[model samples]
Target chain A: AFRPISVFREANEDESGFTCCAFSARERFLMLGTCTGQLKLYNVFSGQEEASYNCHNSAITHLEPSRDGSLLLTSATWSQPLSALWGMKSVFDMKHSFTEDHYVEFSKHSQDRVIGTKGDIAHIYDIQTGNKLLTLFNPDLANNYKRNCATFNPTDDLVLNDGVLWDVRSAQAIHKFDKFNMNISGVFHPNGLEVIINTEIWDLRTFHLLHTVPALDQCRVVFNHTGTVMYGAMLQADDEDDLMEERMKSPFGSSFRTFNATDYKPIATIDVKRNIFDLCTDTKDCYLAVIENQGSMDALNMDTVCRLYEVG
Target chain B: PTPVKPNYALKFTLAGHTKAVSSVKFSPNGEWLASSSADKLIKIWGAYDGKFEKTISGHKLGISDVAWSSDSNLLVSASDDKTLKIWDVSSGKCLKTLKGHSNYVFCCNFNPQSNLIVSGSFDESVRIWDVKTGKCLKTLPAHSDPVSAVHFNRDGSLIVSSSYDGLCRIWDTASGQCLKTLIDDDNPPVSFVKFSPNGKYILAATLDNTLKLWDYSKGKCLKTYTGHKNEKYCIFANFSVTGGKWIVSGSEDNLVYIWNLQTKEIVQKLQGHTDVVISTACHPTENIIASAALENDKTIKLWKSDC
Candidate 1:
């Protein structure tokens, strides 16, 4: 419904150097993880580098700064598949080295524990003592099944993988959605109330189907700070006969649509010039950040551009 | 909640401080306001009427920052005298004189829980003090340069501090462990840092003449709010009553400014102070603000939107 009112770009760096980014607890500096496993800090106001750390030898896979901006959590490929806690300089504090490739998710409730997922297995480690406290495996899946993703429920010790919610202190599963697909893009509400996977929105507590919407195959769902407004961005279908004819009628490529989180009704849609890569909103749900990118060689300026807009 | 139309009407002008006013804060209970000034005095004012209530005068040197307890009955102030003093707001009596900082005590605040007082000083360190016992619990070597500002998150488990070395650090309040360091490419000395009401973002006032908005959890600087004079003085910036929909700040241009949090455009510029505005604070429960001005404009001004 509205166009981006302003744009801020950092183009002086190596193209695609920024792989992942995190905001400090106070939002003062922007820490950008590079393709070469370097952590570069940029002044939020001036867009200049304040410091850079040779954090990992290779590309960084996962990086997060604590809520207080005190500790940095990073996992990389090169030196080993290990996640380490970093201080200000070259100091490496506590580390969890993995024998196999894994994904790390810090607990949303406390800084003491983190979840590490490898293949069909997941391990919970106490970050303070460097001890593995729990091992999780989906009992519903056979040997042919693979673990898709896992995350901690906010303010709880519960972890969710695929469609199953597991309590870390329990041996049995807490709940599971009857018809859930793990192969598609899915995300949870920051408050741990609902999980939107592809076309389905399931209540996290009771595993009930809240609502369903007809959307494209490669759609991504993003929630604002308070989880008030949920956004969905889908790619244009490849079948080009009717779709291509419809695509040419619009001024831009993909259109991001906003839906009512409570009723699942399509509220509004705004057109954009490029494919949407990432979307973010402030805590007040007042502003929206859209990261746009080129889909293929058919587009100009392959670099991702950052655009800011006012939204509900 | 829908956004209310912004209002920039001048509400009342508070008069008491005889010298430069460094900081002004609204009491958590929303009934009173506190101002710390270079006159070595701290005054309490009626938030709604701007009537003078009581003046606590004991600091030998200029006071820098002041914060109120949850009930608004007590105040903790930092001063260039290198000490922090707790005051009884009703009686205007100094409760306890805290002495630990070797250099100027620049900034201080009470934890949301009201049990701990955190102070930052020119000694490049941050100390956490037990409020009831008047004892220093933790001393953290925060930065290589003078610590300029320190604040406790709403949960009070974490602390964020900025320094003259062009760095900002987050620390664990209980463990006194440094958690993270935020340094930009240029490492410009920072002036102030504050957490948003929801604890979702951090607002950093830098000497680069700009105010930076940060998403602390993700370690990203979402936006840099500019157009205000911030090259001199520790001009403070705060989020509006609707949480983060708007931002209000003081400027060296002798005006108080408000910007749209999303668009970063200066929506309203309030002009009244005769001298540079040093600090501005938003009322926690109302659409009002209190701003402090330097030297010649030593009086505090209260503002609101007539809408």
Candidate 2:
């Protein structure tokens, strides 16, 4: 069973809620991005706010820590789309920024490069010079489909753009998978041989469909550090009818489920009794953080908090 | 105390490759030998008995170079397919294919820790890769012309890359910064470069028919060796301590040349190959040398010394 260890809230009383959160590489500090474009770092053990920075002008949509724990990346909304890298020192310093549209992320292998998408095309940029090193796009599907997202595989040589896998060096499409009409943010397994897009597991070597995890339907899934376990955040019940029924049936409006990553077997579930906005796990799998938001009838009564849980 | 002269004789003339043998390497344990060829294959053999072990064949084009992991469990090969491949030695299986170079990969070496790889390519780039994930960590636009050879120091803290641009550059492995650049006054195209075992000096082979030892930190030439011709092909040279402190190199004149490290004089001229000898490998623990040549002489010759 998962146990609550501590709770983290904004240092000052603010109505803004957390949109995304990530743990530092060493799992010493927890970094969170807020709907007000504010970035905050907290000591995981003491649950004390250590530092804060206002790097974005709009609500931050994504927050990620580098694999080496030396830098942080934050991305805000698409209206004034901005992504920036910040140093992870005592005094956080802004290193670089990309004003491109869509998603941006640090490369898995190295912190020297980042992948950013401009509509259907994906571009790899150098972190220090901000120079575009390579542009990845499939001309064959340019007229028919537009890639909604882009990300790097574990090896950093292959980039997944929606259903297409591209070789960053050759700037050519290596494989194009069966299209999914919905927005697909693909996640690569730690071994890099398989990718999870929605509920389907696809083999990268043969480009074949492996299995569909029905239990993870409509769920945002992420793998643990060792890929031994997977966590899925269920979509919140937002409709009036569904909320009315769920309010009386159970106090919890949302929940998180854990499954065996190898066989996709359900292991356990946790009900947080509130709406969950985002979730992240530490590298050691010792702790998990869930951003929860509470909305009340009065505007001033709304609150957002991050809860830490010990993993067993 | 008196200095002694060493006598070397041909031990084996192993013939298998159908095309030119481009590079040869002995495993760190001195138990296995690996060779890459223009036939798009890498063959492994028993280091002591010259027995053929296995062949790794998956590259789309000719293979240029090969390096052995410190544990002797894996081998990495560079090829004209514009990629490098890491192979599991025991299984004879290709484990990973590292693709990033736009042109032919010319040379590759494993760091002392066996966790990192440095490769030079015809694309004029030197790339460092993580061996475990086969991901390129850093790409340095190192030269103006094709890069010929690349190697890491004994400590794996620095890298040395030689290029056809007639320059040899030293790079910091951690920071990806150019620490220093060395060039001769004549500026002949450098074919191969390596750090001394102590990591204080560099040995570079140039197309000007000479090999020079450089005090890399000071950017000064410490010694020069000459005699074997190397104006056309990219021959390789390295420090050999088998028969005392000597510098050994293959030559376009179809002979292996050995020079005294201190006196800078030709000590021995080995003759066997009918075509230009392109590569040579020194045993890590024994007084044995393996030499490979071009198309007309596809056999690999092993030479051993008895003091």
Candidate 3:
């Protein structure tokens, strides 16, 4: 059952901070990342704010729900990443909890992580133990600006990179040695295909001959729930440099390119109509629902627009 | 019944009232109007015609509430000067003065059953008097905060008052006994309270941005009316005299609302006041409603509730 909804007013207003928002799995509540560096929860039924607090110094960078949607992991604009958990309940309950003491970060062994920069890695936090369960990283030995996330994958324990596997049961890392260039966008193919990673600069010198997959320049990457398809969006670059002078626009918008997980075949290429700072999707799989980041560059502005679409 | 939503949308302009218009009243016969602003002036106009009529100037402070006496030629206006004055409608001059309040007098009302006046004040008291003899009859105090609004029941025997303490206490007019408490919020005070036209219930406006109803006999909150999208910051509410079947009041949220008495729901919303619609009074004979709106460009607009 597919329904087409128009861009509603008021929700498009970017003034109240949390300029970006995502609905929970049940759709009963919405989690919003505001420009104030705080996260606010709102009960959609009552249209009332439930709770909110500053999670990081910068605005929320990204957010996602766990396997069953019971746990949520959120990232903000700090070179150092801090992910926190929450307690979900009925929409009628009003709660204001700002002193959450269980916030954890992924900086134990990692020291070079920038607070709000893209080079910062993701951290999995245990809600009960308040410990950094594992450090998330995309081994970009094959690409640059390796900040692309796979959203949430379906592994019972943990995930591994290309030719790399981790035995969570024994807490061991197994490396299948097949060296390649750095990778920028990647996802675990739900169809048990090879881990597909792509570079942002689609050119000849960046390992132009990996064999099957062509060079796909993009930024954000994730896989479908079925794990059969992988997708990605574009990344922005600095305005200078002669080799990429015509390519590097001031800021880049979101784009979509799909890859067949089983055979690692590129099938779909989708592009949005406008440009924004960032974009997100419900899942990394085929024809997933996605949302675009929209805001005004002017301070006196009172309006903004968010684009929600399905991969056609 | 579900709240009466406008079948059609209307343009709302709230950018009126440059300075606070404190006291507003609809004429007893429902044709003329009176408003007092912090500008220390009283402006009277024609309700239906929307034409300026006369202006009374003498009050040193903002006028609190305005009322028309039995004789259409007489106007009773209260002010923060701790005094109430009687004025001749034609001459527009203050005639008689009833002075007793030690602080800013917030609200005053005239009783139809007798020639008596009741006023509430920031000093935490409600005073009743014989309007003609200029004699103070009684003073009632109940809540911890300043008493802002007080009124006699439709039958003139039951008195209902609301204070800054967030409680609306009902009193017996004859014996001066606390009869019941309509609202008992320990958190914030109800802004105003009024007896329903039919004597069946009481209506209250609160700091919580809600208009609520209480059973007159039991003091139990029957229903909470929801329509104001902002804080309801007013101290006066009056029922439509033409059996309009609703209690109308103004708010800090920049809208005038006519609330249904039966269902405790918003019947109609009048959006024109720029800031807070500080106070509202209904015409004694017609469907006209007038409000003293706070600081904005257009301070006063007579509403024909029948619309």
What TM-score does candidate 1 reach? 0.49
Q: Per-chain TM-score of chain B, candidate 3?
A: 0.85
lDDT per residue as tens, model 1, B17-52: 877888999998889989998767898889888999
lDDT of 1 by residue, A82-179 (tens): 56666543453434554343467678878777776665566777766767778777657422223355667777566766556677777457766554
The numbered model that scores best in lDDT is: 2
- Name model 2 segments beyond 4 Å from true: A1-312, B1-3
Ranking by lDDT: 2, 1, 3
Please report, in order, the local distance difference test score of every candidate based on alpha carbons: 0.72, 0.80, 0.56
Candidate 1, residue A19: Cα displacement in angstroms equals: 58
Tell me the docking grade of candidate 2.
incorrect
2 or 3, which is superior by TM-score?
Answer: 2
The segments of candidate 3 whose C-alpha lies over 4 angstroms from its true place after superposition are: A1-312, B1-18, B183-187, B229-232, B241-244, B264-267, B305-307
Question: Interface RMSD value for candidate 2, one decimal?
Answer: 26.2
lDDT of 3 by residue, A63-124 (tens): 54444544555554321233344434433221111122112222212211111112324334
